[PDB]
Amino acid sequence: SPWFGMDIGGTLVKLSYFEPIDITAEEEQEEVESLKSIRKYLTSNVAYGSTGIRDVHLELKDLTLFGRRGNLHFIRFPTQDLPTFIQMGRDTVLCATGGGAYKFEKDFRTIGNLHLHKLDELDCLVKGLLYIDSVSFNGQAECYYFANASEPERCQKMPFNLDDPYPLLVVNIGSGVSILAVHSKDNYKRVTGTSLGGGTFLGLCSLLTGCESFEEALEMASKGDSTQADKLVRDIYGGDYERFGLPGWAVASSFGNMIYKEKRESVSKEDLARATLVTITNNIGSVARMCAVNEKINRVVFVGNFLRVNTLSMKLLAYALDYWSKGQLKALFLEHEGYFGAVGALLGLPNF
Amino acid sequence: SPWFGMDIGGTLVKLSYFEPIDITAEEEQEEVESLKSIRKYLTSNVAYGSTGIRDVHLELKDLTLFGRRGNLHFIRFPTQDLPTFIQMGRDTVLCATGGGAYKFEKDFRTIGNLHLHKLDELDCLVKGLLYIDSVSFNGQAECYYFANASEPERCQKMPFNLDDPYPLLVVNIGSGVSILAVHSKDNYKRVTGTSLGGGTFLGLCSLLTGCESFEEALEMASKGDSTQADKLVRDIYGGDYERFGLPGWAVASSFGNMIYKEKRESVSKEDLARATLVTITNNIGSVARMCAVNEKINRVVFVGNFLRVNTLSMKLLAYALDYWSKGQLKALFLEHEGYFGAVGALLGLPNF
Ligand SMILES: CCS(=O)(=O)Nc1ccc(CC(=O)N2CCN(c3ccc(C#N)nn3)CC2)cc1
Ligand SMILES: CCS(=O)(=O)Nc1ccc(CC(=O)N2CCN(c3ccc(C#N)nn3)CC2)cc1
Numbered sequence: 214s215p216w217f218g219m220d221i222g223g224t225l226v227k228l229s230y231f232e233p234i235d236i237t238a239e240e241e242q243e244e245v246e247s248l249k250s251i252r253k254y255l256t257s258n259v260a261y262g263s264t265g266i267r268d269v270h271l272e273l274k275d276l277t278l279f280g281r282r283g284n285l286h287f288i289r290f291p292t293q294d295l296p297t298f299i300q301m302g303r304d305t306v307l308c309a310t311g312g313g314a315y316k317f318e319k320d321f322r323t324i325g326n327l328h329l330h331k332l333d334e335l336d337c338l339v340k341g342l343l344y345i346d347s348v349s350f351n352g353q354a355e356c357y358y359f360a361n362a363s364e365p366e367r368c369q370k371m372p373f374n375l376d377d378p379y380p381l382l383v384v385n386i387g388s389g390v391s392i393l394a395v396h397s398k399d400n401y402k403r404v405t406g407t408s409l410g411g412g413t414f415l416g417l418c419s420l421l422t423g424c425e426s427f428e429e430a431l432e433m434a435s436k437g438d439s440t441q442a443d444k445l446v447r448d449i450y451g452g453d454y455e456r457f458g459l460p461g462w463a464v465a466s467s468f469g470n471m472i473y474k475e476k477r478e479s480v481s482k483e484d485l486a487r488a489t490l491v492t493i494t495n496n497i498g499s500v501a502r503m504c505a506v507n508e509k510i511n512r513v514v515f516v517g518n519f520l521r522v523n524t525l526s527m528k529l530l531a532y533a534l535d536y537w538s539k540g541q542l543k544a545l546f547l548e549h550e551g552y553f554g555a556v557g558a559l560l561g562l563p564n565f
Numbered sequence: 566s567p568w569f570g571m572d573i574g575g576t577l578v579k580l581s582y583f584e585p586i587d588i589t590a591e592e593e594q595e596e597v598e599s600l601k602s603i604r605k606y607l608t609s610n611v612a613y614g615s616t617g618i619r620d621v622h623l624e625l626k627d628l629t630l631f632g633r634r635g636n637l638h639f640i641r642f643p644t645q646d647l648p649t650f651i652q653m654g655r656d657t658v659l660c661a662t663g664g665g666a667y668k669f670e671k672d673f674r675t676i677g678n679l680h681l682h683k684l685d686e687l688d689c690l691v692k693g694l695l696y697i698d699s700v701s702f703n704g705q706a707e708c709y710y711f712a713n714a715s716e717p718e719r720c721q722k723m724p725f726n727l728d729d730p731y732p733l734l735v736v737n738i739g740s741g742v743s744i745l746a747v748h749s750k751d752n753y754k755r756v757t758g759t760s761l762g763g764g765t766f767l768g769l770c771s772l773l774t775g776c777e778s779f780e781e782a783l784e785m786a787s788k789g790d791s792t793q794a795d796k797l798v799r800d801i802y803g804g805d806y807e808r809f810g811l812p813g814w815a816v817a818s819s820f821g822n823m824i825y826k827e828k829r830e831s832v833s834k835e836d837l838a839r840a841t842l843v844t845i846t847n848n849i850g851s852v853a854r855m856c857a858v859n860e861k862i863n864r865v866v867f868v869g870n871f872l873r874v875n876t877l878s879m880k881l882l883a884y885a886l887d888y889w890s891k892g893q894l895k896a897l898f899l900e901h902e903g904y905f906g907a908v909g910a911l912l913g914l915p916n917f
């Protein structure tokens with residue numbers, strides 16, 4: 214039985230697979246051809262079908278898990294393509310989390326003799342995050358931050374130690390946003406959430422710009438100027454609003470200059486992509502800051518796949534959290550952001 | 566010297582004008598023809614030029630102010646048209662607030678001998694709100710709420726008494742959003758703000774639907790189904806997410822179904838208008854609820870012109886605040902929502 218952890222989200226399926234590397238001479242004879250073929254298929258390819266991808270750079274090597282040494286692999290594909298995954302599977306214990314573990318329960322059971330064990334998406338997130346940070350990223354820090362995030366000449370990635378992880382605010386930016394307050398390994402609450410998340414960025418971008426991939430949306434945004442669409446404090450006051458410490462550059466109204474027809478006629482699609490990214494990211498940062506202040510937590514870690522290959526949003530979050538909190542809060546990031554639920558599922562395997 | 570209070574916002578200019586009604590036989594002789602002409606022009610017309618409107622239904626009659634009896638009138642026009650207003654004024658003490666009091670300071674001073682006194686936009690909001698509620702809306706409650714906002718068969722406008730106004734959370738939904746915590750008549754702080762406000766609704770709506778008025782945007786939204794654009798919890802889980810009490814109908818990802826090309830091709834412009842309204846309104850409600858919980862305030866009053874002739878957003882706020890706070894918070898509304906800054910400015914007149 215291959216060891217898989219699966220997080221079926223609203224947008225992406227995340228899969229963690231443990232490849233044993235201490236396979237004996239006898240265990241290799243006693244392995245069934247279908248199990249050898251699956252292991253070879255997964256380790257021999259970095260693209261699976263037309264939409265599956267193995268994130269090779271995230272692989273954890275020579276991990277000891279459940280008493281065996283092996284490599285921990287990380288794979289993703291769109292939830293839209295799960296029927297293809299299941300159809301391939303029909304031609305066996307699966308720990309599954311995320312909403313899709315419930316929605317597609319009946320589909321997984323079309324695979325004969327498959328044992329489906331549903332686990333909670335946020336329990337799995339916490340357990341997976343704590344595990345990866347505990348075992349390190351092949352000796353390197355799993356957690357990092359942007360040092361001196363207020364000065365761009367100095368803003369650089371630096372490692373952050375999470376040996377005492379508690380308390381922690383976890384901001385899970387997926388299709389939507391969940392915000393968690395973690396007080397201990399078995400004590401955490403979902404403080405709140407927002408529906409303005411990664412799916413809002415991509416959905417609005419596609420409506421506004423016609424982009425048809427997450428990565429193309431980011432590339433457009435990198436070329437845009439969000440101030441062409443946004444109304445700034447200095448557009449309203451002529452400068453800073455000093456009485457309440459609002460700098461002239463702060464956004465007073467996202468997309469607020471688009472109420473003027475002449476401005477709608479001159480804005481570029483790249484400007485609209487950047488304004489969408491900035492709007493979503495600032496709102497997440499602001500909600501994270503309010504939750505942090507109320508939960509009395511000063512370490513805020515942002516995860517989920519809205520931030521993969523998305524340095525613009527990470528730097529924006531690093532800078533905004535530091536600036537608006539007057540330096541009281543720290544934006545933290547994790548190399549395996551995307552995959553913690555899938556790992557937490559995999560870790561539930563001994564219970565079955 | 567006519568008595569005017571002006572709030573020049575990022576989007577709208579709001580003007581409060583006190584019409585004296587106890588004018589003597591001698592005071593009428595001693596009044597200059599330009600002052601009689603302005604008073605007649607304002608009381609004889611409900612539309613001013615092409616874009617000025619007097620909200621006749623809001624007028625406060627037989628108000629005693631500064632020792633004179635008169636009528637308090639409420640007038641609005643787009644900040645974009647302020648040059649026309651100033652040009653008409655060139656062919657005199659003005660208390661002015663909002664960002665435009667600073668940005669257009671030099672323009673107001675083109676009016677010979679005009680004395681411009683700038684006042685803070687949130688000081689003026691608090692003073693004006695407390696004043697109007699204190700004098701009543703011609704004997705009727707200035708403040709109201711939607712009773713039994715969870716049951717639509719019972720959801721009806723009902724009056725709310727604010728004789729002891731403190732503490733109060735004031736959510737000012739204009740171009741952007743300011744959130745205030747009012748502890749006493751001279752003790753209040755701006756807790757935070759969000760840039761997802763009324764200008765975001767109108768700007769995104771215009772980009773997405775081509776609507777070209779606030780009122781047309783609301784009319785489109787009233788005909789739409791936001792769930793055509795939004796991804797709901799039940800789209801992700803197949804039902805409720807029970808472990809964290811998220812009902813299947815809650816929005817998991819605003820515009821989140823627009824990541825799928827086929828869904829973008831079938832959504833209507835009315836659906837996109839409604840999804841924009843719902844997205845903005847829920848986010849304001851959520852931010853208001855977090856601030857309320859942290860400031861330890863259970864009365865939340867929503868003002869600003871995003872809510873004028875906007876019952877959909879008011880009912881959405883009433884319902885959402887009650888539902889998500891498990892009944893701990895009350896959404897309150899005010900008949901003169903839009904105009905409190907302009908009134909507060911007018912009330913600063915004795916200081917000059
Ligand atoms: C991880 C479970 S998921 O996969 O299904 N994704 C998911 C689901 C829901 C949400 C939004 C949320 O958590 N929400 C909705 C907005 N909420 C409001 C709304 C109005 C007010 C007021 N007034 N207050 N709160 C709080 C609760 C985000 C992501
Ligand atoms: C009434 C003055 S106005 O006329 O000029 N209108 C106006 C001006 C600014 C705002 C937004 C705001 O108040 N903002 C911006 C967002 N903010 C953030 C952003 C990121 C993070 C993080 N991490 N935290 N806070 C807090 C402060 C709304 C309306």
Ligand SMILES: Nc1ncnc2c1ncn2[C@@H]1O[C@H](COP(=O)(O)OP(N)(=O)O)[C@@H](O)[C@H]1O
Nearest residue numbers: 222223224225386387388411412427517518519
């Ligand atoms: N290849 C990709 N395809 C679709 N969305 C992608 C993507 N790469 C990054 N993203 C972003 O990641 C978000 C989903 O993150 P994720 O954490 O996996 O959400 P979920 N709800 O599926 O569990 C999307 O909303 C989008 O903003």
Ligand SMILES: Nc1ncnc2c1ncn2[C@@H]1O[C@H](COP(=O)(O)OP(N)(=O)O)[C@@H](O)[C@H]1O
Nearest residue numbers: 574575576577738739740763764779869870871
């Ligand atoms: N006639 C109208 N024209 C433009 N916007 C209007 C409007 N009637 C209502 N609105 C709404 O009111 C909002 C402005 O409210 P307001 O409180 O006056 O903001 P502000 N920043 O000008 O001080 C706009 O963003 C729009 O959503």
Ligand SMILES: [Mg+2]
Nearest residue numbers: 222223311387
């Ligand atoms: Mg997820």
Ligand SMILES: [Mg+2]
Nearest residue numbers: 574575663739
């Ligand atoms: Mg205003």
